[PDB]
């Protein structure tokens, strides 16, 4: 879509809305794109705000090389212009930043000396503007996560700034706070001697005091007048903005100066006490780019706007709740919608394996670890992941597995372990137990009935972290079992009807992703025994309508399931047979 251009694309989810398909496109044998899709197609657009991403190895202009640090040389990252001096060379200003930020202290305090180095919080990095690179076109300093300004002409005057002045009751301004996303200086103005010197490249050094928030710059061994004071807990990314006037533009030098700690000691918490400069592989140069996609939300907040009268003005009303699940990247201080991982492969894989690790650390009844994990992944996140239809299949399976492992697996395993033993107390209701419901020798619905055999006891503990007791670390964390049961039945009812239509878009992208996690959760609940009476009737009706009808539509058993789903159905039928055997054993004990 061009400037001031408006368009509409119809994917033909409703064939009736297509206005020219019948006259041209239906008879020819073509199909609407959303011919038999149950839900709307996710819509992706070009992102407006530029973001910082690692420089591709195949970038036509920018080349970044990592010079390892020797005994006498600091580790260096060198940014070079590949296509300088040739046609298609890009002359505009590039914005460069490093991947990891320096995080200032939460509360501000109010021959190098080893003790000073070990007690200090001051960190340093320096930049060598190479000879022949025009220094007035190069800026060095720090930026925050808010920097998304892409301008062909960048000047320090047009940086985004705000000054919050908190005053007392009488009006005196007792405190003034200056806030900005960019804290950088120019090399052209930094050069007091000026011109080009090849004894050493123009070396602006950035000094950050994490305990005071003071940003001071040193150019060629003399401190520049420009200084910045930042807010507590500010995350500052080393950044260099430069316009290429030579094949060699600038170089990040991760060294250290007298009594000032290296950048790695602040970036990495493992190297917090290591004065030796380091450039771990995680650190890498990132650049601002427009080449990224943005995902349109499937559903937006419903807002009603209207003017009641001249007196009342305009009314804005939003009364229906809507939530999205946000994935926060810790290193970049960036958060994205978890549904955007459908097109981001590396984050999807890493998060699926993180979910696997979450399931593994609490495996086989580690109730304390499960309680700890309840903080990281909670009931609302679990329920939203379970119910959401646009969740990627891998994340869907992982979240079903995590929900089963944290809350349900311990008691499910306990009842499975006690399943093959029949300790039947001999009571009045036990005597009342009979093989058949009535004189007609017709089997009752499996599971439904009066069972008196001794069963394991269900106990759960509320995962509260303000409490200082330790008795809660036995027993699995509590979950809203009634809500889980109702939602599982509702989701199975939806899945049976929708999958039979054989839609192009199942939940998770495949029938296996749609059914295996859902049927596994249903089987876990059945094994635990939450399903009682009417729930058992409905679920058996779903499994096979004809057989389990009380004394059309096809069930799960005859809907052409994949092999993994068939294995789960076999497990369900095995459990039903086990229930019938238990009923038989109890009836024999009753007769005895």
């Amino acid at each position: 879509l061009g400037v001031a251009q408006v368009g509409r694309m119809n994917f033909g989810k409703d064939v009736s809305t297509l206005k020219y398909f019948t006259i041209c496109g239906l008879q020819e044998g073509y199909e609407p794109f959303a011919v038999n899709t149950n839900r709307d197609i996710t819509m992706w657009l070009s992102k407006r705000l530029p973001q910082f991403l690692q420089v591709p190895s195949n970038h036509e202009h920018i080349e970044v090389t990592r010079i390892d640090g020797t005994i006498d040389s600091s580790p260096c990252l060198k940014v070079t212009q590949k296509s300088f001096g040739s046609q298609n060379s890009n002359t505009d200003i590039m914005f460069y930043r490093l991947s990891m930020p320096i995080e200032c202290a939460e509360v501000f305090s109010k021959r190098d000396d080893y003790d000073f180095l070990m007690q200090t919080s001051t960190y340093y990095y320096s930049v060598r503007i190479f000879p022949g690179q025009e220094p007035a076109n190069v800026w060095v300093g720090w930026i925050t996560s808010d920097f998304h300004q892409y301008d062909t002409g960048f000047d320090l005057d047009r940086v985004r700034t705000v000054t919050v002045t908190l005053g007392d009751e009488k009006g005196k301004v007792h405190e003034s706070i200056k806030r900005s996303n960019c804290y950088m200086v120019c090399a052209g103005e930094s050069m007091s001697p000026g011109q080009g010197r090849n004894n050493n490249g123009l070396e602006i050094g950035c000094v950050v005091d994490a305990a005071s928030g003071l940003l001071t710059f040193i150019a060629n061994g003399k401190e520049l007048s420009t200084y910045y004071q930042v807010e507590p807990s500010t995350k500052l990314f080393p950044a260099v903005f430069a316009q290429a006037t030579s094949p060699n533009v600038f170089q990040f030098e991760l060294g250290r100066i007298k009594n000032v700690m290296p950048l790695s000691a602040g970036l990495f918490k493992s190297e917090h006490k290591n004065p030796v400069p380091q450039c771990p592989p995680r650190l890498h140069v990132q650049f601002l780019s427009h080449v990224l996609w943005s995902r349109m939300p499937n559903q937006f907040l419903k807002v009603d706007v209207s003017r009641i009268s001249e007196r009342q003005g305009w009314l804005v009303q939003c009364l229906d709740p809507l939530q999205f699940m946000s994935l926060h990247i810790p290193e970049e201080n960036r958060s994205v919608d978890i549904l955007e991982l459908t097109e981001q492969e590396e984050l999807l894989k890493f998060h699926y394996h993180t979910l696997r690790l979450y399931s593994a650390v609490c495996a086989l009844g580690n109730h304390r670890v499960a309680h700890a994990l309840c903080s990281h992944v909670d009931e609302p996140q679990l329920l939203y992941a379970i119910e959401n239809k646009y969740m990627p299949g891998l994340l869907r399976a992982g979240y079903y597995d995590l929900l089963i492992d944290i809350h349900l697996s311990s008691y499910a395993t306990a009842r499975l372990m006690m399943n093959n033993e029949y300790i039947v107390p001999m009571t009045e209701e036990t005597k009342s137990i009979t093989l058949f419901p009535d004189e007609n020798k017709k089997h009752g619905l499996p599971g439904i009935g009066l069972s008196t055999s001794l069963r394991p006891r269900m106990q759960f503990s509320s995962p509260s972290f303000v409490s200082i007791s330790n008795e809660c670390y036995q027993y699995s964390p509590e979950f809203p079992l009634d809500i889980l049961k109702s939602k599982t039945i509702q989701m199975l009812t939806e899945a049976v009807k929708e999958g039979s239509l054989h839609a192009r878009d199942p939940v998770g992208g495949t029938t296996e992703f749609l059914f295996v996690p859902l049927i596994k959760l249903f089987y876990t609940l059945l094994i635990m025994g939450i399903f009682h009476n009417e729930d058992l009737k409905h679920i058996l009706q779903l499994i096979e309508p004809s057989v389990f009808k009380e004394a059309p539509k096809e069930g799960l058993l005859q809907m052409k399931l994949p092999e993994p789903v068939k294995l789960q159905m076999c497990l369900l039928l095995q459990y039903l047979c086990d229930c019938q055997v238990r009923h038989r054993i109890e009836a024999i004990v009753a007769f005895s």
């Binding site: 107390p425 089997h443 057989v547 076999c570 047979c577």
Partner: protein, 263 residues
Amino acid sequence: KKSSTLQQLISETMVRWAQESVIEDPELVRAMFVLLHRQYDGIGGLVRALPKTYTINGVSVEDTINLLASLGQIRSLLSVRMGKEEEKLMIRGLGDIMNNKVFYQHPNLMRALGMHETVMEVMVNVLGGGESKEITFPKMVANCCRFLCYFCRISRQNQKAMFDHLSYLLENSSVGLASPAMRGSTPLDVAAASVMDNNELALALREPDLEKVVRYLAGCGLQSCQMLVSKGYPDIGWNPVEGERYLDFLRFAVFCNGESVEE
């Protein structure tokens, strides 16, 4: 006609799946055929279940529930790596079981639940772990051995059920024989209590298992005690401490109820 029965429905579904598709998953094939065989072997389910069926009086329901909870804790400890807290939990569970009344009043339920076997696999795992470096977690091994000896003393049939596993206890008898204050709490002591004062079990006792004990006694008579010389005891050529253990086991093997089993 409609299936109208879970058995018929499952049989038809399994055969129908198998004849529609060549199943690529061996686990799926085995699950389907196990389920079909269960449908066609309804008698076998009762044959399997009835020996594991027990009826308890209404007065002991909660007490049996507590015993079952303790046994479930012990059974769940089978699937975790051995450690300090696992040792503490196992010792507490065994103590609760031994102090519980059903363990005494209903020895048949105890055998049906396979509690002695579970204690056996726990002890097997701990004995296998760190076999060369003396024995790790000696306290819970001693506790399990005491529990097992008491299980032998509870009932005669429990003694035979424990006797059925005497073979293993003999090759792992040489565990805590040298260490004092562990006497009466070793696999050799468990094996001895497995045949203590039982003519039928003494007669069923074989020749090779006696030969194994004689071999261990010969080894103790030939070579000294590495643990004792490491702790600094003077190096005499032979091992009286373990020799006496093997001798008293042979004493229990050959002498029963005041008479001598000549065989």
